[PDB]
Amino acid sequence: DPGVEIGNNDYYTWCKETLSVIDKDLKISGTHSYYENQDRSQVSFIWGNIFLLYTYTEGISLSKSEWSDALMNCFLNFDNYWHPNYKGIAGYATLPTSAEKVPDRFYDENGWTAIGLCDAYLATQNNSYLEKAKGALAFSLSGEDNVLGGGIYFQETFVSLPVQKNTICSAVTMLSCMKLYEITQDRQYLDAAIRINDWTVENLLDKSDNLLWDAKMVADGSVNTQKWSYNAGFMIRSWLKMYQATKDEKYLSQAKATLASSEAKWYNSINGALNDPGYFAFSIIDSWFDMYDTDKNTVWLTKAFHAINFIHNKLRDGNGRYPEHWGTPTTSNLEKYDLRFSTVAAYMYMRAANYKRILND
């Protein structure tokens, strides 16, 4: 029973507490923008804001009236990161930008954002959210070409990084495509997800453990074989959507094989720890929630609540802050922190609150 794991845990309150501390530490006074880190000297990179977007969006499921304004204010902050036309195409930048400036854009960042904006549209029916979801996803899809036979580049403007195509770009683009396919019923999104998936499985999936390698270098086809939880997790979420859309059992079997291997590699089911950066490992928890949505087996929720309980009860420090990595209990207060460390925890708490509500309905 997940009931045993949920107990009297007030996930909804834990989320609000976490958001309060984030705002205190990192909200830029007089704005709805956030600093990157404890130095409070640079506006945040887009990524930590994406976890806020996800949190407020999920909040709508708990209370539309409580979270609608927060979601809209977040969306309007994202407008600061939107570039309406750089070298012929619109898309989000990693830092605030405007039409007359040169942006630094990433195909993965745009897909992470597209996912959130699709969910925001599903929650609210606000067309402006979907317009940007489509624009962000179009930007991600513009990173796809037949160099290496397919796949999507890490970034628009390579400088110090070698030119490469990356699993996370495949995976967030696939999931975005599947969400927009559900909304629009336009088969071109489904076909894109299938094409990108076929390339990704052929080039970046390790058949020995069903985990995902990180990237493939354009210069020589060499693979970065580092295995990160989020490369598996976003592929699992995508495959589960593809299963729902196609009813082809191959997607479910692949999702289950990759998820089992992800649990074996990263999850200590005894204490609930996830042995990776939180801003990656949360994707395994979202995979468990998707599995519950798929088969209604409550054991998936027991795992999710156990891991989220660990975050609160073992990772949270004496100042209500969160560490980068989820693998080990926190034993002293953090001196350094970036926006994404606590925002991902807030998101997890809101997801947990939602599933607690669903179980008690």
Numbering used by the authors: 36 to 396
Question: What did the article's authors report about this structure?
Answer:
Initial merging of the data with AIMLESS in space group P212121 appeared satisfactory (systematic absence probability of ≥0.98 for three 21 screw axes); however, the structure could not be solved after several attempts at SAD phasing, with poor contrast and mapCC (correlation coefficient) between the two possible hands for the structure. Subsequent reprocessing of the data in P22121 allowed facile phasing of the selenium substructure and model building of two complete BT2949 molecules. The crystals of BT2949 belonged to the orthorhombic space group P22121 (unit-cell parameters a = 81, b = 121, c = 126 Å, α = β = γ = 90°) with two protein molecules present in each asymmetric unit (molecules A and B appear identical, with an average r.m.s.d of 0.07 Å across matching Cα positions).
By comparison, early studies have shown GH76 enzymes to be far more specific, with activity only detectable against the extended α-1,6-mannoside backbone present in yeast α-mannans. In this paper, we present the crystal structure, determined by SAD phasing of a selenomethionine derivative, of one such GH76 enzyme from Bt, BT2949. Furthermore, we show that despite poor homology at the primary amino-acid level, the tertiary structure of BT2949 appears to be well conserved in other GH76 family members. These enzymes form a long trough-like structure, which is consistent with a requirement to accommodate extended polysaccharides such as α-mannan.
